[PDB]
Design a binder for these strands. Sequence first.
RNA 1: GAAAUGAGAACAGUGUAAAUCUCUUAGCGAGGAACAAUUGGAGGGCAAGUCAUGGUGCCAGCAGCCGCGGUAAUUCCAGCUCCAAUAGCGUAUAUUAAAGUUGUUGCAGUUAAAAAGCUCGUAGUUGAACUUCUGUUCAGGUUCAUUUCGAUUCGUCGUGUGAAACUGGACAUACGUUUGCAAACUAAAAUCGGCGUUCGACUUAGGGAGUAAACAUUUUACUGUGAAAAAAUUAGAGUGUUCCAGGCAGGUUUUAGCCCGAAUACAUUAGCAUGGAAUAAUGGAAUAGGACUAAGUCCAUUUUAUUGGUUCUUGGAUUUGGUAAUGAUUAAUAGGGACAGUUGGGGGCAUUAGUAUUUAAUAGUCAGAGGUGAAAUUCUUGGAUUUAUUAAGGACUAACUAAUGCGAAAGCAUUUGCCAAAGAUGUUUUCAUUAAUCAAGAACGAAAGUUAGGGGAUCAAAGACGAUCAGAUACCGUCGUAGUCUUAACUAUAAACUAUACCGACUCGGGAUCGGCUGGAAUAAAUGUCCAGUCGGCACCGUAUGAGAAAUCAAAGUCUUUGGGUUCUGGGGGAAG
Lengths: 80, 129, 97, 141, 150
Amino acid sequence: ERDLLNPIYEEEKQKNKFKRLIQAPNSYFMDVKCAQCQNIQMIFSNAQSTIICEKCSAILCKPTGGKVQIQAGCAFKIKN
Amino acid sequence: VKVNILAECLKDLVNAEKMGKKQVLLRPVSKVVLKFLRIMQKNGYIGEFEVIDDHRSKKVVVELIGRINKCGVISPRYDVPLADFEKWTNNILPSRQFGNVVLTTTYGILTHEECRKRHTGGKILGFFY
Amino acid sequence: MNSGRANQRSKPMTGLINDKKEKIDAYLPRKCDWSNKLIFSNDQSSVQIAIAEVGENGQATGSKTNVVLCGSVRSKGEAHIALENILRERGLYPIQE
Amino acid sequence: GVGKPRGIRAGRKLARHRKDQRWADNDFNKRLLGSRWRNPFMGASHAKGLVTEKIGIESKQPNSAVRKCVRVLLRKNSKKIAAFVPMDGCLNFLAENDEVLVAGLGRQGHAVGDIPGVRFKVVCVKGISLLALFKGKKEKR
Amino acid sequence: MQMKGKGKGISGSALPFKRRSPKWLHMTPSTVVDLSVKLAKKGLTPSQIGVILRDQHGIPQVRFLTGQKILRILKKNGCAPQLPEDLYFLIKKALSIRKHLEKNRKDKDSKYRLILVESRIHRLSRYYKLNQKLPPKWKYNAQTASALVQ
RNA sequence: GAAAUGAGAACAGUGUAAAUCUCUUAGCGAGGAACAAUUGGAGGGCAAGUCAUGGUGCCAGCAGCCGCGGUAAUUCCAGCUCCAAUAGCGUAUAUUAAAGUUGUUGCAGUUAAAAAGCUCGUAGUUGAACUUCUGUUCAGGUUCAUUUCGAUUCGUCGUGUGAAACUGGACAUACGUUUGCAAACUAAAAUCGGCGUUCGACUUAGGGAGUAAACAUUUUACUGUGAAAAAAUUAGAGUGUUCCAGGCAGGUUUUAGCCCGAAUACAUUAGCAUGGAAUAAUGGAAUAGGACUAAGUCCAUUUUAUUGGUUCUUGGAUUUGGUAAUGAUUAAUAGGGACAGUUGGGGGCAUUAGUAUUUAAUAGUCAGAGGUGAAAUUCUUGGAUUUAUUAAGGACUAACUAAUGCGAAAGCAUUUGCCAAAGAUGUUUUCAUUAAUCAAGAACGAAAGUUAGGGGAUCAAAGACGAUCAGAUACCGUCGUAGUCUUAACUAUAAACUAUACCGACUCGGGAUCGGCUGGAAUAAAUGUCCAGUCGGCACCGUAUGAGAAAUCAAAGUCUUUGGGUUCUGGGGGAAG
Ligand SMILES: [Mg+2]
Ligand SMILES: [Mg+2]
Ligand SMILES: [Mg+2]
Ligand SMILES: [Mg+2]
Ligand SMILES: [Mg+2]
Ligand SMILES: [Mg+2]
Ligand SMILES: [Mg+2]
Ligand SMILES: [Mg+2]
Ligand SMILES: [Mg+2]
Ligand SMILES: [Mg+2]
Ligand SMILES: [Mg+2]
Ligand SMILES: [Mg+2]
Ligand SMILES: [Mg+2]
Ligand SMILES: [Mg+2]
Ligand SMILES: [Mg+2]
Ligand SMILES: [Mg+2]
Ligand SMILES: [Mg+2]
Ligand SMILES: [Mg+2]
Ligand SMILES: [Mg+2]
Ligand SMILES: [Mg+2]
Ligand SMILES: [Mg+2]
Ligand SMILES: [Mg+2]
Ligand SMILES: [Mg+2]
Ligand SMILES: [Mg+2]
Ligand SMILES: [Mg+2]
Ligand SMILES: [Zn+2]
């Protein structure tokens, strides 16, 4: 027995992006702080490209299917 | 693709009462789907129901009493003069006692029966008993 | 949503009543409480459970509550969850010390 | 859905389909192809004719017997006909060259289970119902 | 799932509920409109521009922020990409196929694949022409394709 | 045993142009072969013989289809007795129903007949969701309910409540505007009376409401009435002696006149009038321009007697300025594109191996090899088979290779390198119905086969031989041509198989898989392993108060509780593809 209108948070957290009721994504946004310049740039959780630090020109993120690996030790807050 | 979601929603629901589901989630929903729903509700077939706001085209959840025996639509929604009624009443309904053949009119949507009251009716929509 | 549920059990169940407001149906059949289906005249696998009423001291009272569970629901291994819920409804499954 | 299309705008389709898929019926295909007119009677129910000769035919499968039959010449049609003479002594009345009235046996096609290629019955001799000649108190020439 | 009696699935993308613009971000519609048209001037697809504004400058959904869909913004600012991504690209690969086919005049799987791709293009033309979003005398044959190559 | 009585036959009367007949009616008119029932059956279907009946003996014949008949026939011939319809009853042929056996409703399509081998694709058919919802109050009925009221009787009305919904109003940013009518009430001003005001009657203004015309993009569709000949069908009245049926007839007791009738409905399809709010299609402002409003200007113009000239009313054209929240629904667990790592025996060019089969060289011996159940043609000391090295050549990709992978299907497995392509996953990217299926019409489609060249190692249709057999131009054995390989043409079929059309939504349990992704743990920091999710892809296990003829089916399911969209196919068998 389960209510379909007041579903558990966990359950919906497991389900597939499009299966959840209100239906929302997983992607998020993050302020990255270069390993040098320090500049704080916003990068999308699913960047589809390599990202440079507009200050110096360092490498911050490498693209993948879904996740974006962050180059070396750079900082990252999840804006939400 | 999809078509007459009223049909999409309807059978999904029948499959419900038939399987003994405790409640149902209808995915693609419209004014029609909802009107039909409150008409079944009003006549006492389905229970309380909630419409969730899918920012695209709402999702509805209908509680299942356990009195729905069958509720479907009718292929092309033929036109039906008031004279064409008994034909369909003896046709679709399991008796001269559960008269529920929903139709579309200019006067909105009425029960198989209400259409005789208002005296107009028009195109068939669906049925439930 | 208790809503619909409370309202179906609401009034009494009475079979085919004629103009002369007479009941005619040879007998009024038992109805499955968790499903609201009809219990046959020969439904082998449908059962009526008898549960007893207790009186605030660990003692038992000469009072029982019945639960009708149709065939199919009992067959899909529902019963245990079905009953455990008809008992929530009639305020009873949760058994406080 | 099933094969047939359920559109309110697709009546034409269903219509032509039925007119077509309908040729699969022999009863239909039969009368529709003026077939009835080509048989020996030319559609007709009965036909007059002259006895060309009384011949006998052998029974088929589990039966063994000498069937009485007359080879007739239909009038306006002018065809050779195989005609079974009914009851017992019957052929004893049919004199060669007399006028005979013939009709079919159970739906024009298969002959009685017993007979081979015979499709007709003989009902009149010189314009005298056979039954009549079969029962003494009736008629004879 | 288009030209596929057998293959079919779900790539992704589901716009979040909250129809307003993210909190953290501050940018009068105009601010974006500049980036958008600037970026566009460099020669970008509204398809690609939007990608930047999400990966680079945290703007999830330009439409939600401006109240304007990219292509529209662009068209209002003269920076309109003549021929739509849709058609453009299909025709691009449609062409790439032809070139490859030449030196491999025997590669049959490719003859087939092109047949499908050329088929699509005729489907877009039918469409884009009907929305008076492309001159009626438009015709992709081989000259329409090589015409864009110059 | 006597009464009864039409057939029958009749003077009269009626009727008729005459005549016939009917009808009324006197004399005459019924008791057993009579004053009269047939026709067609009696195994089953199909109602009726269990006769120990006679004749016939697969003969004569019956039989609609099963089947009867060869010496003891329940189906023949006939007797008897029975059954069925009965002034009727058989038969032949076409046709209706049974025929959900031509199917829109309402079929079938794995194996019974039936999905096309497979994809593309204009006609056709089919198409996601949003746009006054809603509330309050009044009123007219309607119903239903009633610990209820007043009336009547052999079953209704009125009254009250609650309720629902209808309606119609009103009002609430809310389906209209003008007109004329009527008007219903109110706010002022006037007049009139009493004592500026308390009040009253009577005027202007004001919209509902109340009609008619003008408007709400255009149809579908539905309401309703106008139209849809008569006769016929249904059907009211109506004792033609009932009835068919005609439309007449009812009361002389108001009889030189009375009473009453010849009604009504249905009529779909296309046209007309008209009420309309749903579904459905269609449309309005996106280059811009639209809208409303004021003025200016230009063109056109009615009435002013008429012609000019001005003006002006009325249409249209622009410019400007003002007003208005100026004008583009979401973004389909639909579809198309962009992008990102990645995956695959997908494909096309290159390239590249590896053993093996042949065949050749270089050496090495020695009498047998090879083949079968046995042997036999076959090969061999001008050296076989054999062993080592090596080479030429054409095909082939082993073992890993499995209910595992990719490709529309046919089909696809050595390395490496290019060439254009693809799924799935990932997306807070765009585009926003672009789509589903499809006659026409095209792209493919192992083999075998065909044309013209290549190539020719192995196996091998035809063929040549051995053996086996009673027979062997067959199943074994020895050889061998076409092919098998390839380039370029052509051929399109195959148990082209899951014998199960594609798109879509649902519904049981369970682990294991292949590809992608996201969390986590250990090592370790691995293009690895494991735990847990989850999309998408083969497949399996268990099970169904779901399906079936069953085998069986998680779909072959959500179909008598018979209807998501679309294409193709079948209609007893054989002759026949
Ligand atoms: Mg037989
Ligand atoms: Mg899908
Ligand atoms: Mg007389
Ligand atoms: Mg007597
Ligand atoms: Mg008799
Ligand atoms: Mg007989
Ligand atoms: Mg007899
Ligand atoms: Mg006998
Ligand atoms: Mg008969
Ligand atoms: Mg037939
Ligand atoms: Mg108003
Ligand atoms: Mg390759
Ligand atoms: Mg050999
Ligand atoms: Mg070699
Ligand atoms: Mg593999
Ligand atoms: Mg290998
Ligand atoms: Mg070809
Ligand atoms: Mg050759
Ligand atoms: Mg021998
Ligand atoms: Mg050989
Ligand atoms: Mg991980
Ligand atoms: Mg896993
Ligand atoms: Mg079946
Ligand atoms: Mg199974
Ligand atoms: Mg069906
Ligand atoms: Zn830096």
